[PDB]
């Protein structure tokens, strides 16, 4: 799933 | 998979250079490279996802005003830069809030830790110090906000995806908005899920008192009222995924304003739409990890101001009032006032 992540 | 492909070749004793001779038809790899290193090169090449490339036929700011005129269904992706002129500091820029938080919060490692649920449970004070400074009800929206608002009123705005939680687009009049990271609209107890509106916790927030649940036992320490701000690790709202599903095949123009695009899945939006759709960047710094068609670099207000004057009509009625100073770097990059890449 597309979870809020710092990339 | 590419990975499996290489595995099978390793079981056979295949020379990687044999595969690389036609996978890199014009390039021979330097003599002093490991075999496995070469195989990793093979994996990366084969598993490289199809990317959008810059359109060669779209470059200039004149091209940009052309697109703004003829396009309906525009997606505008905004970030914190769009609100710094309103009086709301950045994360990326010089003298953010973190410089002042690290002063008396030695445990706070990065700005992103304010939106870390584990750190929050440990000590929610840095978050609520941030909340008081950025809390809705105290700031006037910028020229950009007004610009996006006018686009929506004209029926040209497909949607404005914002990473901002300042809720300034409500003030500006931007109705076709998605708040990708939530807002301060409600607040909920971590423990019992007792929900409450923004007002109920506002008093405590401006008094630097951590808003606590009035229903949970008073001795329970984690009974804190947390605003519906999406934290890292958590899911984005249902609206985001629902809107992107419809919008990805409807958009004919993407503008990115005031964002470093370092946070997923919002940062994937330029990668998620059709490759032919034109992409404009309006930002203080360039973003080399993406392929924008036109790069307008500087304070987004002075750039938008310039764009509006060129557009005339209702758009020119917005801006502060000739052109604006810029350094043009062919084919597609413009350096306006305020452009900067900060480091030390
Ligand atoms: N107002 C807000 O909602 C707000 C404020 C501060 C931090 N944040 C967090 C920041 C983070 C989202 O990343 P992002 O939105 O990219 O913030 P960011 O700090 O990572 O990036 C801001 C980008 O905008 C650029 N910029 C700054 N000022 C201007 C300007 N005046 N004109 C044009 N460009 C400018 C800046 O160079 C940078 O590339 C989320 O975690 C937010 O919660 C949000
Ligand atoms: C293993 C990674 C990091 N390591 C292992 C590397 C170490 C060295 C090199 C490299 C250095 C000099 C020349 C070359 C060359 F590819 F032979 F030209 C490769 N490349 C890579 N790597 C590459 O991925 N190189 C590479 C080289 C050429 C193309 C690609 C690529 C990746 N996706 C599309 O193309 C990737
Ligand atoms: Zn509770």
Same domain, B177 and B54: yes
The answer to the question of residue B128 being in a domain is yes
Beta strand ranges found along chain B (DSSP E): 74-78, 157-162, 177-179, 182-189, 195-197, 225-229, 253-257, 263-264, 279-283, 294-297, 327-329, 333-335
- Kindly determine whether residue A3 and residue B235, on different chains, have CB atoms separated by under 8 Å: yes
Residue A6 with chain B: CB contacts under 8 Å: 112, 232, 262-264
Same domain, B75 and B148: yes
Ligand 3 centroid – CA B32 distance (Å): 63
The answer to the question of residue B146 being in a domain is yes
The answer to the question of residue B260 being in a domain is yes
Same domain, B118 and B198: yes
Q: How many domains does chain B have?
A: 3
Same domain, B135 and B58: no
B181 is catalytic: yes
Other Cβ atoms less than 10 A from the Cβ of B317: the count is 10
Beta strand ranges found along B170-240 (DSSP E): 177-179, 182-189, 195-197, 225-229
Cα B203 from Cα B268, distance rounded (Å): 37
- Using CB atoms within 10 Å of the CB of residue B335, give its burial: 0 to 12 exposed, 13 to 18 middle, 19+ buried: middle
Query: A4 with B263: CB under 8 angstroms?
Result: yes
Same domain, B126 and B193: yes
DSSP state of B48: P
Cα B274 from Cα B334, distance rounded (Å): 25
Cα B172 from Cα B166, distance rounded (Å): 12
Same domain, B102 and B210: yes
Ligand 1 centroid – CA B261 distance (Å): 9
**Which residue in the set B181, B235, B267 is minimally distant from A7, CB to CB?**
B267
Cα A5 from Cα B228, distance rounded (Å): 17
Same domain, B163 and B260: yes
The answer to the question of residue B335 being in a domain is no
CA B239-B210-B206 angle, to 5 degrees, is: 85
Is residue B62 helix, strand or coil?
helix
**Which residue in the set B112, B115, B233 is minimally distant from A3, CB to CB?**
B233
The answer to the question of residue B125 being in a domain is yes
Phi-psi region of B167 (alpha: psi -120 to 50; beta: other; left: phi over 0): left
The answer to the question of residue B333 being in a domain is no
- Return the residue matching tokens 């040209």: B156
DSSP state of B220: -
* B181, B241, B289, B309: the active-site residue: B181
User: CA-CA-CA-CA torsion for B211, B214, B220, B223, nearest 10 degrees?
Assistant: -50
Residue-range definition of the domain harbouring residue B177:
50-91+142-181+237-322
Same domain, B25 and B105: no
The answer to the question of residue B344 being in a domain is no
B213: CATH: 3.30.1600.10
CA distances from B281 to B115, B177, B294, B300, B332 (A): 27, 19, 6, 10, 11
Cite the DSSP H helix spans in B135-196.
143-153, 168-172
B171: CATH: 3.40.50.1220
Same domain, B119 and B13: no
Same domain, B255 and B298: yes
Q: At what angle do helices B300-311 and B61-70 cross, to 10 degrees?
A: 60
DSSP state of B271: H
State how beta strands B182-189 and B225-229 pair: antiparallel
Q: How was this structure determined?
A: X-ray
Query: B88 with B80: CB under 8 angstroms?
Result: yes
The answer to the question of residue B343 being in a domain is no
DSSP state of A6: E
Resolution stated for this PDB structure, in Å? 2.7
Residue B264 with chain A: CB contacts under 8 Å: 2, 4-7
Same domain, B313 and B301: yes
Ion ligand 3: residues, CB < 5 A? B 189, 191-192, 194, 213, 215-216, 223
Interface of A with B in 1-7 (CB under 8 A): 1-7
Ligand 1 centroid – CA B185 distance (Å): 21
Beta-carbon contacts of residue B223 (< 8 Å; ≥ 6 apart): B189, B190, B191, B192, B212, B213, B216, B217
Domain termination site, one of B236, B251, B277: B236
State how beta strands A5-6 and B263-264 pair: antiparallel
Q: Mind telling me how many Å the CA of A1 is from chain B's nearest CA?
A: 8
Q: Mind telling me how many Å the CA of B266 is from chain A's nearest CA?
A: 8
């Amino acid at each position: 799933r597309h979870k809020k992540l710092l990339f | 998979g590419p990975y499996t492909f290489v595995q099978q070749h390793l079981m056979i004793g295949t020379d990687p250079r044999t595969i690389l001779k036609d996978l890199l038809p014009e390039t021979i790899p330097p003599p002093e490279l490991d075999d496995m290193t070469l195989w990793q090169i093979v994996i990366n090449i084969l598993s490289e996802p199809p990317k959008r490339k810059k359109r060669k036929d779209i470059n200039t700011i004149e091209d940009a005003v052309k697109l703004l005129q003829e396009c309906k269904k525009i997606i505008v992706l905004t970030g914190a830069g769009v609100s710094v002129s309103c009086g709301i500091p950045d994360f990326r820029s010089r003298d953010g809030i973190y410089a002042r938080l690290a002063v008396d919060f030695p445990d706070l490692p990065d700005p992103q830790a304010m939106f870390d649920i584990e750190y929050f449970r440990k000590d929610p004070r840095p978050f609520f110090k941030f909340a008081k400074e950025i809390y809705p009800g105290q700031f006037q929206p910028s020229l950009c906000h007004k610009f996006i608002a006018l686009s929506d009123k004209e029926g040209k705005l497909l949607r404005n995806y914002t990473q901002n939680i300042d809720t300034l687009e409500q003030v500006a009049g931007i109705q076709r908005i998605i708040q990708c990271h939530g807002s301060f609209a409600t607040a909920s107890c971590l423990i019992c899920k007792y929900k409450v509106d923004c007002e109920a916790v506002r008093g405590d927030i401006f008094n630097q008192v951590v808003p606590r649940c009035p229903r949970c036992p008073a001795d329970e320490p984690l009974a804190i009222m947390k605003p519906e701000i999406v934290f890292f690790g958590e899911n984005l709202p249902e609206q985001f995924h629902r809107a992107m599903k419809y919008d990805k095949d409807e958009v004919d123009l993407l503008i990115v304003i005031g964002s470093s695009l370092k946070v997923r899945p919002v940062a994937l939006i330029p990668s998620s739409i059709p490759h032919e759709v034109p992409q404009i960047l309006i930002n203080r710094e360039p973003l080399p990890h993406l392929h924008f068609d036109v790069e307008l670099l500087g304070d987004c207000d002075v750039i938008i101001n310039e764009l509006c004057h060129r557009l005339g009509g209702e758009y020119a009625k917005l801006c502060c009032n000739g052109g604006s100073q810029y350094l043009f770097l062919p084919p597609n990059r413009y350096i306006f006032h305020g452009a900067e890449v900060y480091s030390d």
